[model samples]
Target: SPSAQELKEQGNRLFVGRKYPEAAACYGRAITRNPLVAVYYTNRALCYLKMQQPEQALADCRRALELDGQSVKAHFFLGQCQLEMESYDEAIANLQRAYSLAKEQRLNFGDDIPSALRIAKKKRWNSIEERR
Candidate 1:
């Protein structure tokens, strides 16, 4: 059996190729080998998002958080998954948390977080209905 690091490397390569499902599988295998590695769950969550399975992505993000509560990438991906699933309020909360963590870590999202937050905010307002 391949080691967790090897599986993580395989997953990384597949992700770069945009083969998200395959990447997810590799990440899952890695997790099976070393379930405590938050990075594996984070990467797999990203693959789930790429595969358009937001719920699965959210689940993976939650698992990552359980392992590493301060994982910015996990929170960021969780925000993205919630946005994709039209959970705008939840997305906003998660993304805000992500931003705070990223700022504290001196990390960047290459503008992805800002862009998603803008869109999700707009959708949130548009979907809101006043109860008369």
Candidate 2:
């Protein structure tokens, strides 16, 4: 049996190749081997996102956060899943939290948090306007 780290590496490679299902399978194996690792759940959540399984992604993201509330990656991915689900308010909140955490930890998540925040805010505003 491959170690959790090895499975994660294989998942990463498959993710990069756009083999989302295969990547998810590897991540699942990794998670099975080491269920306590937050990153494994986060990685699997990402694969679920790429597969358009946002509900599954959201569940995994929530699990990751439960395991490690300080994980910016988990927040980011959770925000992403919320955005896809059209939960604009929730998405914005999670993305803002992710941005704050990333800044505090000096973790580079590029423009993802900011971009998602902007979009979520815009969508929220639009929804409000429509309801008016």
| Each prediction's TM-score versus the true structure | 0.91, 0.93
Model 1 lDDT per residue over 30-112, tens place: 99899999999999998898888989999999999999898998988998998888788899998888888888889877787
Off by over 4 Å in 1: 129-132
Steric clashes per prediction: 0, 0
TM-score, model 1 to reference? 0.91
Q: List the residue pairs that clash in candidate 1.
A: none
- The best candidate by lDDT is 2
Model 1 residue 106 CA deviation in Å: 1.8
lDDT of 2 by residue, 1-132 (tens): 799999999999999999999999999999889899999999999989989999999999999999999999899899999989989888888999999999999988678778888888988888899998
Which candidate tops TM-score? 2
